[PDB]
Write an enzyme that holds these catalytic residues in place. Structure first.
Site, short mmCIF file in Angstrom:
data_model
loop_
_atom_site.label_atom_id
_atom_site.label_comp_id
_atom_site.label_asym_id
_atom_site.label_seq_id
_atom_site.Cartn_x
_atom_site.Cartn_y
_atom_site.Cartn_z
N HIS A 183 -2.08 2.50 3.53
CA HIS A 183 -1.61 1.59 2.55
C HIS A 183 -0.14 1.13 2.67
CE1 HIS A 183 -5.45 2.32 0.72
NE2 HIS A 183 -5.54 1.12 -0.11
N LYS A 220 2.24 1.98 -3.14
CA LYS A 220 1.31 2.65 -3.64
C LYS A 220 1.56 3.80 -4.46
CE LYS A 220 -3.76 3.07 -3.33
NZ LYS A 220 -3.88 2.40 -4.53
#
Ligand SMILES: NC(=O)C1=CN([C@@H]2O[C@H](COP(=O)(O)OP(=O)(O)OC[C@H]3O[C@@H](n4cnc5c(N)ncnc54)[C@H](O)[C@@H]3O)[C@@H](O)[C@H]2O)C=CC1
Ligand SMILES: NC(=O)C1=CN([C@@H]2O[C@H](COP(=O)(O)OP(=O)(O)OC[C@H]3O[C@@H](n4cnc5c(N)ncnc54)[C@H](O)[C@@H]3O)[C@@H](O)[C@H]2O)C=CC1
Ligand SMILES: NC(=O)C1=CN([C@@H]2O[C@H](COP(=O)(O)OP(=O)(O)OC[C@H]3O[C@@H](n4cnc5c(N)ncnc54)[C@H](O)[C@@H]3O)[C@@H](O)[C@H]2O)C=CC1
Ligand SMILES: NC(=O)C1=CN([C@@H]2O[C@H](COP(=O)(O)OP(=O)(O)OC[C@H]3O[C@@H](n4cnc5c(N)ncnc54)[C@H](O)[C@@H]3O)[C@@H](O)[C@H]2O)C=CC1
Ligand SMILES: [Mg+2]
Ligand SMILES: [Mg+2]
Ligand SMILES: [Mg+2]
EC number: 1.17.1.8
Lengths: 245, 245, 245, 244
Positions: free
Chosen positions: A132, A136
């Protein structure tokens, strides 16, 4: 058909607004957000409503659409077993309107999970890598933790992953999620990515899902709209429509 | 069960001898190679045979096995509709004998083909990349060609892959198999590899099978040996034993 | 430095305006687009210009910038030998002005090509796979073709890629760019991606570049901006700024 | 050249014996393992030695080789700053002799580490993922740890990897090696694989190395053997021979 959107300026809602107009088959009717009356649905001659709002409001939304005539495609999360009985209960007396609720409207995400579940049984090893962007907060992602839990359930009749590790640095082997290693990469330049890795003597099998923006949900939802007229009553998940399970 | 191996000294056959030996539920009863009479199978009271020989000899082997009521799990390739029909004629006389012929005994390959088929209708684009060692005679591989044919059949009634290509060097966009691009990489150091790619705006899905070694064929074969008598007559393919429906 | 942008309303140019404003060692001093007088740069006391315009306007702009002693970082394409020579000619009169012209400002892209060139000779096999969105007109991409030619030049005097292909469907083996296969995938949901594959018995090496955004060009341009006064005359390419020796 | 293998019965040594035999330009002159006297090298008129033995025997091996003017290609590990200085001191007595000591002879691994060092300077994020067969004892691998350390060193003076992680399960983010995440996958069906990921908003760059067997070191060793006398004295690493 004629489409309405609830939570029509939220992250997912605003995306669904642009998508319906961009479709040839589909015409926009109602765009309701916070503070809006639900009359605008009946005043817009809507056939099908998409809902990406909030757990605290969605139940009130559904009680309406069922007692009306408009079909409901619901992505909004926060759902329990006693909550579905309420939806089913409203549909008992009203057997003409169809409803669908899905925790994930991303087709590739739903397909990955299903394939992982089918594959789990046939390999000595399973691990998850998710990758990601670096903003995040949660590691691993909800999707990777859920995938790991599901693969582990699919594997409950098999030995654990083989692993002769006898010396390691802390964290090298990932998060242990019900016996499945989950690794979490956070890299500028990335968005949302998940690989599921299976391996056994002489072969490996890898499933990769890549989302590059919030339109990953769009085809799934639009599928569920183009198709909600087919099956009546409540349907949970996107998998029935994917001729999977 | 008492299991014999035909092609016992071959590359795959020797592998199977070892696995039948190591398998505690199976009793290795015969190991036949070139110049060994088939009578060795019956002297050993063989119940099931694994055949990994050569297309030139397998029909005569199969005739003997069927005539003698010995189940057969055949990996040997070269099977045509005519050969399948001949096998079925022979089995008419032996209603309790079972034969399973599989063109691909790698469970991971069979799964990946199944998954490609299931995903194919739900994305805008589909292509196949296959990658093999530089001694491979055929491009694309049988498996990739088969995969692209399956994917195309799955997508019947749906729009072709989107592609604005208007200027290209010959061959850039791969081999066209029924509208599905297939790219074939020949690279020293590789073995056998295939990646199926699916995409729509906002998301992609990829299924990568890597075949490193012939031990990969073992679970498929042994599953067929163990399950052989469940279906009298001829079964083509491993798919049915995987219980994917 | 005081930095201006030519093509400020453009796809790449606006990305560059934002970049300059955000970086607090650089003062955005001019944002010109079509119909804007070049005098705006001088009236902004601009020291360096980032140019992302059109092949049809760039030489004119360059002539201005060079005459006005404004250092130029040019991303605009369409540069030929004749165009470089003209720029060389203009800088004879203005020896304390620097011009940097690069066909690719993505550091990742620049590095990958350099790495591909360094690796090429030490492997039996080299192939290029590129993958783009399906609105791309040309296959293979300029970058892929150019990477394949660099790889071939580096491999001069080495055997060709080994390849025992005796039967194939046309196109399976990709575009032959100077003896280097190049495969072009056109898939919805992708942007710009390139993979260079190297293999010899016992090992493989892969370099994968993924380009998701026009912000991919930002660090290359800003590095060029910060370092442009450090080299008189004309620099062609971003590679010399990356200090790769 | 007449080439001897020290450690000829070992995993790598036996691989070298086969390689030297099959090599058209090189003549296998000796095959030594434990308990073979070093005089067998001089008996066979050995000109170059490949050494894949053990940290405890290698310096004695080197002493003998340098004394007898025999060039050394050494893969055996366990070398220290002190051990390098000893070898260099011995080399003053024999300016005629070349030694090459390399921690990794797989050219593709050496290339990937070189590429990683170069790229590390130019991106916001760097991480390492390595993937091995499930009989591997150490996590992460020696190579992966070495790589993360070299990437860290290249990134001195850059901000750390961005990372907003505020909730995690233990282990999810890998081993921290000098500020560089390193993830170790252990999977049946694999051999030895390593991926180095760099990225900045807009773009990523990945370098993947896959070793398929012990023959991954062969070309690097044979190259070293072929080029050894070009550089008198001690050369550390293969990188110089890859004319980078
Ligand atoms: N199933 C799936 O594939 C996905 C589900 N979700 C879920 O969907 C939900 C909403 O998605 P997000 O865009 O992330 O949230 P969001 O906070 O960005 O959007 C919520 C929107 O709904 C509106 N809203 C609130 N109360 C309302 C009411 N009574 N009537 C009409 N509109 C109202 C808000 O004004 C806001 O615009 C979340 O619970 C999330 O977990 C999110 C992504 C995918
Ligand atoms: N379906 C599948 O998943 C796979 C099928 N195969 C196929 O299996 C077959 C064997 O493959 P390999 O082991 O690579 O070839 P191989 O040539 O190494 O092995 C064949 C063996 O059969 C022996 N043989 C020949 N005639 C015989 C006879 N009349 N009776 C007993 N043994 C006899 C040979 O001497 C040899 O030992 C080939 O057709 C190959 O294409 C191979 C791999 C996988
Ligand atoms: N070297 C590199 O890494 C890259 C180069 N390019 C090149 O850069 C150039 C521009 O790229 P895009 O932003 O995609 O094009 P674009 O068409 O989106 O933007 C060009 C802009 O320049 C403006 N313009 C035209 N004449 C002008 C003038 N006389 N003065 C000031 N502005 C003027 C246009 O009105 C437009 O706003 C193209 O030639 C393209 O090939 C694009 C990406 C990367
Ligand atoms: N630089 C590189 O790419 C690599 C370096 N190595 C290193 O090389 C060395 C050997 O590695 P492996 O083959 O894996 O170990 P191994 O244990 O399989 O081989 C060592 C061999 O050397 C023999 N030996 C011990 N003393 C000797 C002596 N005095 N003269 C001749 N032979 C003797 C042993 O009997 C054994 O056959 C280790 O230090 C290892 O870490 C290993 C792999 C790669
Ligand atoms: Mg047994
Ligand atoms: Mg600024
Ligand atoms: Mg030789």
């Amino acid at each position: 058909a004629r489409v309405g959107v609830l939570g029509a300026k939220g992250k997912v809602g605003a995306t669904m607004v642009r998508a319906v107009a961009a479709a040839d088959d589909l015409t926009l009717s109602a765009e309701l957000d916070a503070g809006d009356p639900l009359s605008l649905l009946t005043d817009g001659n809507t056939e099908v409503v998409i809902d990406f709002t909030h757990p605290d409001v969605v139940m009130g939304n559904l009680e309406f659409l069922i007692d009306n005539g408009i079909h409901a495609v619901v992505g909004t999360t926060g759902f329990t077993a006693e909550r579905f009985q309420q939806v089913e209960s409203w549909l008992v007396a009203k057997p003409n309107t169809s409803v669908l609720i899905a925790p994930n409207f991303a087709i590739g995400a739903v397909l990955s999970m299903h394939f992982a579940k089918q594959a789990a049984r046939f390999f000595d090893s399973a691990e998850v890598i998710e990758l990601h962007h670096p903003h995040k907060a949660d590691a691993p992602s909800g999707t990777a933790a859920r995938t790991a839990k599901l693969i582990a359930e699919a594997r409950k009749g098999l030995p654990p992953n083989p692993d002769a590790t006898s010396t390691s640095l802390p964290g090298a082997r990932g998060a242990d999620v019900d016996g499945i290693p989950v690794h979490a990469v956070r890299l500028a330049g990335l968005v949302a990515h998940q690989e599921v890795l299976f391996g056994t003597e002489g072969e490996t099998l890898t499933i990769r899902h890549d989302s590059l923006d919030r339109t990953s949900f769009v085809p799934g939802v639009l599928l569920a709209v183009r198709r909600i007229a087919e099956r009546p009553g409540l349907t949970v998940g996107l998998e029935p429509l994917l001729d999977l399970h």
